[PDB]
């Protein structure tokens, strides 16, 4: 990754699945990146969102729905959303 | 699974996490050991002594009340049988099969099971000799086995 001097030696840093922590390769066309919008006191989209990336492995297993539900039940409690 | 079959059963007792006696159990350790000696003198074995205590006296585990297993209590009073209970029952079964087999020469199923029972006797007898629970020269003899048991 980093040379002995410090320069980066990677073409890019692949994303990691938000549920399984697996790397998402360039040909994983079953992987999806999702955005959940943030609301205000009134309940109107404010232009802010939280991003979630899922690998094809977990989506093929059918566990994406439950994984997304748990990841959102925790994140919303941290950013004030509810 | 089973030693001498393909059975894979798991049924067994499940001891509770509480090793102490219940608050409703009032009998003391000296009283329990008095009954254990009383039953042993009547011919009962350690297995069927604990069953009576559980079913008729509310003593789930003797070790919880007395701190020692039933066989250890009997040995301390010189009431432990010369041949261990489990080995005794295997010999009794082998005697029964042989007695049945003498009148039924064509019962090849029994002849097969007799081999399994006697091989089970020799594996257990070997263990008891190593732990010195049997006389060093003790040996199982089909001819004289029926005199030992029963």
């Amino acid at each position: 990754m980093q040379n002995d001097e410090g320069q980066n030696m990677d073409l890019y840093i692949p994303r990691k699945c938000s549920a399984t922590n697996r790397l998402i390769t360039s040909k994983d066309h079953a992987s999806v990146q999702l955005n959940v919008g943030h609301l205000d006191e009134s309940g109107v989209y404010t232009g802010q969102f939280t991003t979630y990336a899922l690998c094809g492995f977990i989506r093929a297993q059918g566990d994406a729905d439950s994984a997304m539900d748990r990841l959102w039940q925790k994140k919303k409690a941290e950013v004030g959303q509810q | 699974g089973r030693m001498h079959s393909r059975g894979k059963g798991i049924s067994a007792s499940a001891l509770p996490y509480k090793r102490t006696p219940p608050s409703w159990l009032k009998i003391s350790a000296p009283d329990v050991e008095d009954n254990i000696c009383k039953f042993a003198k009547k011919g009962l074995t350690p297995s069927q002594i604990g069953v009576i205590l559980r079913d008729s006296h509310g003593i789930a585990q003797v070790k919880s009340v007395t701190g020692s297993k039933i066989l250890r209590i009997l040995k301390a009073h010189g009431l432990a049988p010369e041949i261990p209970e489990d080995l005794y029952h295997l010999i009794k079964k082998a005697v029964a099969i042989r007695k049945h087999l003498e009148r039924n020469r064509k019962d090849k199923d029994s002849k097969f099971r007799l081999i399994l029972v006697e091989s089970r006797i020799h594996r257990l007898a070997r263990y008891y000799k190593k732990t010195k629970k049997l006389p060093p020269v003790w040996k199982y003899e089909s001819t004289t086995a029926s005199t030992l048991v029963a």
Partner: protein
């Protein structure tokens, strides 16, 4: 007394039998089922159904261009709701049969590259769900108790069979999307009538 936005929707969903599930429950849908009655029918937890509707709406409003959203239904009962859902939310409705190669064959006229995909039943819309997994297309789907969850990112636990259930679900979802845009006033009411989403037999 006044009913909150959630109690009103749940009251509306009860009247449409949105909570009545199938006699079989998929193992990945058990988390949404509440209880099974002696009849053998599963009862969907409408409290969680409303929460997933909100989560789905948050994903929809985050799409800058609504034309990138595609909502479709294979069964006739939902062919009317999807058309009305796309009318008010600005999405692109595809009622009827899905043409294979729509999301993969770049040379056919019907080729599309949606950013989001909405479906009425994973079991009947298996083709677009299967084909969306070749183009990094996330999918939202209304899932019954016996629905397969393969390649479904957000599954809304509801009864996607009855004509009233399908119409109400899209009516509520369309309202939530608009309310989150500020286009309409908050609350459980909407000037549009729900009956415009129900199936109109010949």
């Amino acid at each position: 007394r006044t009913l909150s936005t959630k109690e009103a929707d749940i009251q509306m969903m009860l009247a449409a039998e949105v909570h009545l599930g199938t006699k079989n429950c998929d193992f990945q849908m058990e988390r949404y089922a509440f209880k099974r009655r002696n009849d053998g029918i599963y009862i969907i937890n409408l409290g969680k159904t409303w929460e997933k509707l909100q989560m789905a709406a948050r994903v929809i409003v985050a799409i800058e261009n609504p034309q990138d959203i595609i909502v479709q239904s294979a069964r006739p009962y939902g062919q009317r709701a999807v058309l009305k859902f796309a009318q008010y939310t600005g999405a692109h409705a595809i009622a009827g049969r899905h043409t294979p190669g729509t999301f993969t064959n770049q040379l056919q006229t019907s080729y599309s590259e949606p950013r989001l995909l909405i479906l009425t039943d994973p079991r009947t819309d298996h083709q677009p769900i299967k084909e969306a997994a070749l183009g990094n297309i996330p999918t939202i789907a209304f899932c019954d108790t016996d629905s397969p969850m393969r390649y479904v990112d957000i599954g809304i636990p509801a009864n996607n069979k009855g004509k009233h259930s399908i119409g109400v679900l899209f009516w509520i979802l369309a309202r939530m999307v608009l309310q989150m845009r500020g286009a309409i006033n908050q609350g459980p009411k909407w000037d549009v009538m729900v009956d415009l989403f129900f199936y109109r037999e010949p």
